[PDB]
Coordinates of C-alpha atoms in Angstrom, one line a residue:
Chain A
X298 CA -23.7 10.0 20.6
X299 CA -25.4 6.7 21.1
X300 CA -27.3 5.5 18.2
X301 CA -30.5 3.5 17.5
X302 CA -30.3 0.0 15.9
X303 CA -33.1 0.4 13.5
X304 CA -32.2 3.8 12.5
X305 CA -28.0 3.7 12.9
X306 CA -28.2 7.6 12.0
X307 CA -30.5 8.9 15.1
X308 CA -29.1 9.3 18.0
X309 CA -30.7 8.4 21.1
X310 CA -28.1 9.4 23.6
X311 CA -24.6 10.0 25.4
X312 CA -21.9 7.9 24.8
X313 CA -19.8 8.6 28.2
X314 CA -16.6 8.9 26.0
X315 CA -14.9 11.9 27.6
X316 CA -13.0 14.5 25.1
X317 CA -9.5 13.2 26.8
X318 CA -10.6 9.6 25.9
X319 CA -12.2 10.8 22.6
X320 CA -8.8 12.5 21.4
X321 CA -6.6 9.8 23.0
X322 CA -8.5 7.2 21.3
X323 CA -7.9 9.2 17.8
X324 CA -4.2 9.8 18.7
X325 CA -4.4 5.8 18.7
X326 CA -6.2 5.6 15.5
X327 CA -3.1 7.7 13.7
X328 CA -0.9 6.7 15.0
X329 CA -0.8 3.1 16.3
X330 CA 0.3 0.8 19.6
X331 CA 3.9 0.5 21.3
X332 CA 5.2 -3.0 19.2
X333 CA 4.9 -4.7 23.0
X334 CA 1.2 -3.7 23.0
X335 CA -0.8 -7.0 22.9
X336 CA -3.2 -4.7 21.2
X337 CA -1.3 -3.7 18.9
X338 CA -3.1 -5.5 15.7
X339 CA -6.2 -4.1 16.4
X340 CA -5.8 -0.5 15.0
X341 CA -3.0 0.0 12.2
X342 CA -1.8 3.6 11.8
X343 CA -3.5 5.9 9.8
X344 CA -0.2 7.7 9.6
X345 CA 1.5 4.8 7.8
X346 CA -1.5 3.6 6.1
Chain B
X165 CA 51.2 2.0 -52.2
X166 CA 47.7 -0.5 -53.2
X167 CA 47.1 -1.8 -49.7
X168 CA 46.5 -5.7 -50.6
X169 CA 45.7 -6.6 -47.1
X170 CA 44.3 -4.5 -44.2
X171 CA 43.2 -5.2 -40.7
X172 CA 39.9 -6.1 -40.6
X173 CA 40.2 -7.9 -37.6
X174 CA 37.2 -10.5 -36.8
X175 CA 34.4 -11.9 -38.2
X176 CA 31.5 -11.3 -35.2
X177 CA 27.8 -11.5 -35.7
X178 CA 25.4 -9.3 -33.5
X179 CA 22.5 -10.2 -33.0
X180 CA 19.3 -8.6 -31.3
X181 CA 16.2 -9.9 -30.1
X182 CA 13.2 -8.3 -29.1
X183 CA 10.2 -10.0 -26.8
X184 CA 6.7 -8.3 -26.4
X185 CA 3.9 -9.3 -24.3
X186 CA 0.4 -7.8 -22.7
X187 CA -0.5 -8.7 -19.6
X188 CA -4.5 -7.9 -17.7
X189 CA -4.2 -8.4 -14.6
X190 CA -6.6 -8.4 -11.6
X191 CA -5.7 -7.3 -8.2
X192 CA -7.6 -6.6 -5.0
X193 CA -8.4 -4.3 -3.1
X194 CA -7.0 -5.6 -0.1
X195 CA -7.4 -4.2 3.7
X196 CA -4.5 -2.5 5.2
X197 CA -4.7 -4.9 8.9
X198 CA -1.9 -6.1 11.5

């Protein structure tokens, strides 16, 4: 969902995050970047962590 | 036979120490980040 800025708990929408991107972004989120990524800071594994 | 010497080797001293302290310490919660 999307989400109102007054009320952060209603939504008020569709985000158009698919179910491939949603799971490949949590994939991410466990597990981390490739070391060459120069994203790589931005989400530390959850599997480590 | 009344043994007037026997061998009882060195005089050594032995000594031991023990040290004792409490510590508090304060430590933060800090963020697991790259």
């Amino acid at each position: 969902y999307t989400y109102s800025d007054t009320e952060p708990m209603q939504p008020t929408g569709f985000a158009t995050l698919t179910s491939y991107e949603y799971r490949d972004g949590l994939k991410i989120a466990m597990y981390g970047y490739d070391n060459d990524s120069p994203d790589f800071a931005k989400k530390p594994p959850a599997d480590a962590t | 036979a009344t043994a007037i010497l026997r061998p009882i080797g060195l005089h050594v001293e032995k000594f031991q120490q023990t040290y004792r302290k409490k510590w508090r310490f304060l430590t933060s919660a800090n963020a697991n980040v790259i």
